[PDB]
Design a protein around this nucleic acid. Structure first.
Ligand SMILES: [Zn+2]
Ligand SMILES: [Zn+2]
Lengths: 249, 822, 242, 249
DNA sequence: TGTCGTCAGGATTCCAGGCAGTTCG
DNA sequence: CGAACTGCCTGGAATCCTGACGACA
């Protein structure tokens, strides 16, 4: 139960947990000898967020025993609003339900909070054949989704051999973006067959606005199977969103 | 009558949610002419009334022990660690209530006052000792009584002063009871009127199989403590008895209970220290069997079971103001206004305007008359000379007319008149209900706006307040000093003794006010506005000169209830700390209680004298009241005829009716009566917490309700009717209601048209019924549930689904169950 | 004892405030020159300020304090109908004033029902069956919660003034009782919840027992099945009278 | 009574006036041959805001008669909000009921404004002996007060030798800030006893919205004593906030 | 006459990219 | 002699308390 994690500057982790809170409120961080893990489902059982951070991310990391703790997303969002980019985040926990967040600098800050428990059921996602993989930049996808957000909500991604297309249909508007290997927004392609699927972009737009511009993304999808967008944190941690498309035309 | 009342109580509140442990009734304390202890309200549906000076209920905590609620501190301490409610407490209902429709007599109880009255009467007729009860006794009488009863004279004095406060020890109680064979002590008498003697036999067996230690006092072979095991018998009635015991766990046994004195003797001495043998006999209650197998007869204790728009100023703008109708906005825009208003005319200057006095000159302008149909104008003299008839148009001469005016440039007059330009938000009226549609002081309106107070459609300033009279009055509680009352005019107490003690119980004064801090602050703001206006209107010295909360105590205010055209004048003597208050039985009569409103509006005399005008009253229709036309202050309650009847009302217990209560007497006996007289979050949380506390009280055993369906089915029908009607309204075109046939946009306003969806309420009410049907299973309503869910579904016609679904739903479960049964 | 002196001091402060208000209003910056809220002397003053007439206070006090309030009000209404203090208009106006004064006296002058809730009272004849009479009681807004006791007392004083005027018994027609029971069931089932669920036979017995007919005013825009009923100006719902 | 003030640093003057106005309306400006004094008052009568600006800071400070004028700076904040950093400001008052504001960086911007009249009595500050004098900058107190305001409602100040602790207490989460010599922003302090005080943020987070950075803020207080928080600019201009101790016992 | 939902709306603070001042081969 | 690296600061936008509306009992 007791642990201590010290890191000089955690604005990335702050905005990450802010996006997780905007996604869902009930979340439990499992602390194991390897690091931290979290898996948040959806109240409408349509979206799944997963994150893992090993012990090669923060500066100081001392854990006693692997367990599962819970932190309120509202109480955390009421905490990250004071995180300076040049601060030293220190998360301390003992045996009692007291969580300490410490910051060292021009004034020693220390906030104590109660620790409630979360009992969300965890189940391993079954393996599914992707048949479509691609690695792109985050800024291009973010600006495309922000340009196609106001016209409609169903954005259609089509992928063929060395070809990608992001389109936005409708009745009084149409948007189209082409992507090839010699373009300025595609890093690499691993397409297998001709796939095409339309997805909603509310949670998409929120989660891609929460992520910075220089970060990269890896999309895995198929014909009509759910999409998985993954990315890496400091080349050590992993974070993946997963959500199914719509059946309509 | 009691069964009919219990059945008719189903018209309101969640039905079929009665506690099986304690019967559905409160205590009966006969008083001349309801009140429940606030401890039950803190531990927690009808009209409420506070009574804090009495005892409270008894419950059990999380530790397993049982304790009773005594005072506010302990109530607030244990108001969260409760496990199950056993008893409801001892609330007071009286006999002087004007109840009709053959309300039968509620069974009374053996009270401590009646008990000690019987005791003193018995000792008086036996040992020939005269005494005066219900008060402090005389020296010689109390000395001879103490000598006869082996008690202390000061203790007897304190007992006669207050028996509930000065409770005698059970040892001396049984000692004095052994001389007269009087019934048992009610305060230390459990409720046994709901048990079977066959089960009582097992109780005595478990008591014999337990541990017991004794202690005796003055030739009374009573006891000292009983240690029992909770597994020796069924703990159902052992917990339903409502006795404070102590629980112990680490004693070589799982559940151990211990009851010490003065709580173990209260259960052992009525059983005769387990000397005689108890037997089961039908048609004879446990108290009857006890009185049979004992030389002492007892009585019963628990037998009484009874059961928008927020307009501020009056400025007619109409559609010229649109929706907000901001005079500042209108002045900035520089637009006209077509109003049907009455204009004035000055004989010297000649200016025309809807104001009363002409600010340009030093005089007041007169009112001109105009015929709206024709184009003629005539003053009041010509109007009264021409018999109020115009030769051009044969219409009655009306003072007002319909024409255009420019408040944009007309506002400078009021600005230079008020001389103060502190304003943030201020709007005028939209519609006029009066026939003459007279004006309103714009300076007073601007002053009210700068004071930032609220107002109704009446035309004056009145604020709501809730009060409830009580039988006594205490300066300690009302917050007034002895010298303050002396300089007020009080020189003696309710018994003629001088006023020296702050904790002096007094009779309820007529002109006293227990009024909350919010009402006090509103009255302070009203007085500030009043002094500002009287210093800016005519230059009058401040009469009240009130600038603090305590300075208002002493002046006079006026109360008024709906359906009461007369304002009751009261004096500002008192205050309040709680959100509620108290009143007087004369200030609050039946016409002010059953008048479609319990609260009453308060006002200041100067406010009425400065802002009251009959022209603020509508022509034909009217609100909850007409107008505070006349003040009234004289309510002489038989001064030279029945002053004793008016004064001698508090703290009397009729021994005659207490003895003659179990004979099915007629409650309508006027002779005996005269003889004895002589959003969503708060509501949802409250409903869920009420259901939870009812479940804790009934020990997790309940059924479904009916008012949820009585709210849902009309909601569904109204929702369907609104969806089939679809009456729209243009946003800026606030008056022109657009037809349900869509024409794209409003032809007079090229924008969206606000529609009446009315679908957000049912979408939020559905989870309530879902959680209710998930917690409790009932029939005859799963059809309604599936119908409303499918209605929402096919009105929207859940378009996305993953490979792993399995959405848990008791609705779908019951649907599949019925499908398989079909 | 000293309570009289304390009330005298209270009325002295009230008179001081009244003199201050009069000195203020002496300038005349408002269309009003007299005191709008005067102090009442007794129930006689209350009923005089409510409906008047201004000067029957002496007779009211004498009758009440000499013979009891009930027969006092009875004789006062008798004198008002007979016109002892003079004339005030027509017989309909006399009956209206008498009913209003009687109701204000029996209610001690606290309820404004006869003041504004019941606007006018007229007598109308039956031009269909035999020429009997009905009270056209033009009500108003503030009558929907007039109070059960006040309504019963108004019915009593109406029957009393009808007996005084000597009118004929109205013949309850089939269409009249049908529209009455229709309005009753409509108000009970759709308009608003009722405090006492009535019965068809009971309301029929009541409508047959009322000697002169009663015709109220309009409440809401709800029609009936039998259109164009003789006697009523429209076919709306008389929920107020109900 | 005519007088004139020609000033350079209109941006600094405007932000100082806004900071003095961010708290509360009432402000009596006193024009004297010794300089410009100001006593700002509130309806709560708990906080007095007295500033003094001498002739050394003013570029051209010409007076003829000392006089006091009561104004609400809320309506005056509209004109001073707009303005560059390097410019010339001229505030002139004559015998008439008008005030002339000349704005000249490179062109002419004259503003003739009316003069409102508010009646208030000047109350002298209670110069009570204290036992705690701590000097800092504005950023630390800004952060602490904003954290207390957005977390809870009560705060307790405890001063000991080279140790200034402030415990923001509420119901769920509890904040604490520590100030020691390691904080370079915190200057020296005069403290002999463990001075304890209690405050709330009901009317404290206002002036924070206008607190700058290059202003030395000194605070004098004792054991539940009225706090005199004075702050200096350019070693010549002073502005003190004297507040009564909103303590609970 | 009490309650409950929706909508827009303008005033507010927070975030981000352009204008400006500044230390590096 | 040019290029990143900040402050900062002002535009753009998300948030929200207030002001309209309709629904039931
Ligand atoms: Zn004039
Ligand atoms: Zn005419």
């Amino acid at each position: 139960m007791p642990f201590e994690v010290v890191f000089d500057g955690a604005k990335e982790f702050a905005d990450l947990i802010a996006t997780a809170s905007n996604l869902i409120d009930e979340a439990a961080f499992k602390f194991t000898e390897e690091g931290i893990s979290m898996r948040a489902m959806d109240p409408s059982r349509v979206v799944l967020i997963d994150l893992n951070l090993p012990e090669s991310i923060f500066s100081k990391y001392e854990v006693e025993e692997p367990e599962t703790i819970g932190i309120n997303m509202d109480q955390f969002k009421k905490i990250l609003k004071r995180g300076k980019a040049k601060d030293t985040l220190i998360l301390r926990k003992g045996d009692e339900n007291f969580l300490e967040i410490t910051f060292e600098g021009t004034a020693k800050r220390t906030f104590r909070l109660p620790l409630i428990d979360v009992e969300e059921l965890e189940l391993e996602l079954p393996e599914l054949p992707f048949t479509a993989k691609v690695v792109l930049l985050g800024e291009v996808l973010k600006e495309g989704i922000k340009d196609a957000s106001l016209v409609s909500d169903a954005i259609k991604f089509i992928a063929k051999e060395n070809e990608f297309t992001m389109k936005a249909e409708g009745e009084t508007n149409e948007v189209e973006i082409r992507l090839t290997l010699e373009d300025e927004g595609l890093l690499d392609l691993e397409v297998e067959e001709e796939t095409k699927s339309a997805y909603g972009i509310r949670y998409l737009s929120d989660m891609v606005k929460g992520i910075g511009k220089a970060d990269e993304v890896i999309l895995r999808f198929g014909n009509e199977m759910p999409l998985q967008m993954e990315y890496m944190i400091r080349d050590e941690g992993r974070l993946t969103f997963l959500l199914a498309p719509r059946v309509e035309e | 009558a009691p069964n009919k009342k219990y059945t008719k109580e189903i018209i309101g509140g969640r039905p079929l949610f009665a506690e099986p442990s304690t019967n559905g009734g409160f205590r009966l304390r006969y008083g001349r002419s309801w009140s429940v202890n606030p401890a039950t309200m803190l531990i927690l549906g009808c009209i409420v009334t506070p009574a804090t000076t009495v005892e409270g209920p008894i419950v059990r905590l999380k530790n397993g022990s049982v304790v009773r609620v005594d005072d506010y501190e302990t109530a607030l301490k244990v108001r969260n660690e409760v496990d199950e409610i056993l008893y409801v407490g001892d609330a007071l209902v009286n006999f002087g209530d004007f109840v009709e429709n053959n309300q039968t007599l509620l069974p009374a109880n053996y009270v401590e006052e009646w008990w000690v009255q019987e005791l003193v009467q018995a000792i008086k007729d036996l040992y020939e000792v005269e005494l005066q009860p219900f008060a402090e006794n005389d020296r010689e009488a109390v000395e001879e009584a103490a000598e006869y009863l082996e008690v202390d004279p000061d203790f007897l004095w304190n007992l006669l002063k207050d028996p509930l406060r000065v409770k005698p020890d059970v040892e001396t109680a049984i000692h004095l009871s052994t001389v007269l064979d009087i019934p048992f002590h009610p305060y230390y008498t459990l409720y046994w009127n709901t048990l079977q003697p066959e089960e009582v036999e097992e109780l005595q067996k478990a008591l014999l199989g337990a541990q017991i230690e004794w202690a005796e006092f003055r030739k009374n072979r009573f006891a000292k403590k009983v240690v029992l095991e909770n597994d020796k018998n069924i703990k159902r009635y052992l917990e339903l008895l409502g006795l404070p015991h102590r629980l112990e766990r680490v004693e070589k046994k799982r559940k151990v209970i211990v009851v010490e004195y003065p709580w173990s003797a209260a259960l052992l001495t009525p059983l005769g220290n387990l000397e005689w043998e108890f037997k089961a006999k039908p048609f004879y209650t446990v108290i009857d069997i006890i009185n049979e197998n004992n030389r002492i007869k007892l009585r019963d204790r628990g037998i009484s079971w009874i059961g928008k728009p927020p307009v501020q100023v009056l400025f007619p703008i109409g559609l010229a103001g649109g929706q907000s109708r901001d005079i500042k906005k209108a002045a900035e825009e520089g637009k006209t206004a077509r109003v049907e208003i009455a204009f004035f005319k000055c004989p010297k200057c000649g200016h025309v305007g809807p104001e009363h006095l002409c600010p340009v000159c030093g005089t007041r302008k007169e009112l001109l008359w105009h015929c709206p149909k024709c184009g003629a104008d005539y003053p009041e003299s010509d109007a009264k000379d021409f018999n109020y008839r115009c030769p051009k148009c044969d219409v009655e001469l009306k003072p007002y007319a319909e024409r255009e005016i420019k408040p944009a440039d007309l506002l400078r007059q009021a600005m230079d008149n008020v001389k103060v330009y502190g304003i943030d938000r201020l709007k005028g009226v939209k519609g006029m209900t009066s026939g003459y549609k007279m004006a309103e002081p714009l300076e007073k309106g601007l002053l009210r706006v700068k004071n930032d107070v609220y107002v109704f459609k009446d035309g004056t300033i009145r604020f709501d307040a809730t009060d409830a009279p009580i039988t006594h009055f205490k300066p300690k509680e009302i917050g007034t000093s002895v010298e303050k009352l002396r300089e007020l005019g009080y020189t003696h107490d309710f018994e003629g003794k001088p006023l020296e003690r702050d904790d002096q119980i007094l009779e309820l004064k007529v002109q006293d006010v227990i009024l909350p801090y919010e009402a006090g602050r509103y009255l302070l703001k009203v007085a500030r506005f009043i002094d500002d206006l009287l210093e800016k209107f005519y230059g009058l010295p401040r009469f009240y000169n009130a600038e603090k909360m305590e300075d208002l105590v002493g002046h006079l205010v006026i109360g008024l209830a709906p359906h009461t055209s007369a304002g009751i004048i009261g004096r500002i003597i008192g205050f309040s700390d709680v959100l509620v208050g108290y009143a007087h039985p004369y200030y609050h009569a039946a016409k002010r209680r059953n008048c479609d409103g319990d609260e009453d509006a308060v006002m200041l005399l100067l406010d009425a004298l400065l802002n009251f005008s009959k022209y603020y009253l509508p022509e034909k229709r009217g609100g909850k009241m007409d107008a505070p036309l006349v003040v009234t202050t004289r309510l002489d309650p038989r001064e030279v005829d029945s002053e004793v009847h008016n004064m001698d009302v508090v703290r009397y217990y009729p021994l005659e009716f207490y003895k003659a209560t179990y004979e099915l007497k007629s409650p309508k006996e006027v002779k005996v009566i005269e003889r004895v007289e002589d959003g969503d979050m708060e509501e949802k949380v409250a409903r869920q917490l009420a259901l939870a506390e009812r479940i804790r009280a009934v020990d997790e055993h309940h059924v479904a309700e009916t008012i949820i369906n009585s709210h849902l089915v009309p909601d569904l029908r109204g929702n369907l009717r609104s969806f089939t009607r679809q009456e729209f309204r243009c946003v800026k075109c606030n008056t022109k209601y657009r037809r349900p046939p869509l024409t794209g946009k409003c032809p007079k306003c090229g924008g969206k048209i606000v529609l009446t969806v009315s679908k957000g309420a049912i979408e939020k009410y559905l989870p309530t019924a879902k959680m209710l049907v998930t917690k409790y299973r009932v029939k005859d309503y799963t059809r309604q549930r599936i119908c409303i869910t499918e209605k929402d579904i096919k009105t929207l016609f859940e378009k996305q689904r993953t490979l792993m679904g399995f959405s848990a739903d008791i609705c779908e479960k019951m649907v599949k169950e019925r499908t398989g049964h079909s | 004892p000293e309570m009289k002196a304390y009330f005298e001091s209270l009325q002295r402060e009230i008179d001081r405030a009244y003199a201050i208000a009069r000195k203020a209003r002496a300038q005349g910056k408002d269309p009003s020159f007299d005191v709008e809220v005067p102090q009442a002397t007794d129930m006689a003053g209350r009923v005089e300020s409510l409906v008047g007439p201004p000067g029957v206070a002496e007779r009211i006090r004498e009758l009440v304090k000499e013979y009891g309030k009930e027969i006092a009000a009875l004789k006062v209404v008798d004198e008002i109908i007979e016109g002892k203090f003079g004339d005030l208009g027509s017989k309909e106006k006399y009956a209206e004033q008498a009913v209003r004064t009687a109701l204000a006296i029996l209610t001690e002058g606290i309820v404004s029902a006869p003041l504004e809730g019941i606007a006018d009272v007229k007598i109308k004849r039956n031009e269909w069956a035999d020429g009997s009479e009905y009270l056209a009681l033009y009500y108003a807004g503030p009558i929907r919660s007039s109070g059960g006791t006040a309504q019963a007392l108004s019915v009593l004083v109406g029957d009393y003034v009808r007996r005084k005027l000597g009118l004929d018994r109205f013949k309850p027609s089939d269409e009249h009782i049908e529209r009455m029971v229709e309005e009753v069931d409509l108000y009970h089932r759709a308009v608003t919840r009722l405090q006492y669920h009535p019965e068809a036979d009971e309301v029929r017995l009541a409508m047959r027992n009322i000697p002169i007919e009663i015709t109220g005013e309009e409440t809401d825009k709800v029609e009936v099945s039998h259109r164009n009923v003789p006697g009523v100006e429209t076919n709306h719902l008389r929920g107020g009278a109900i």
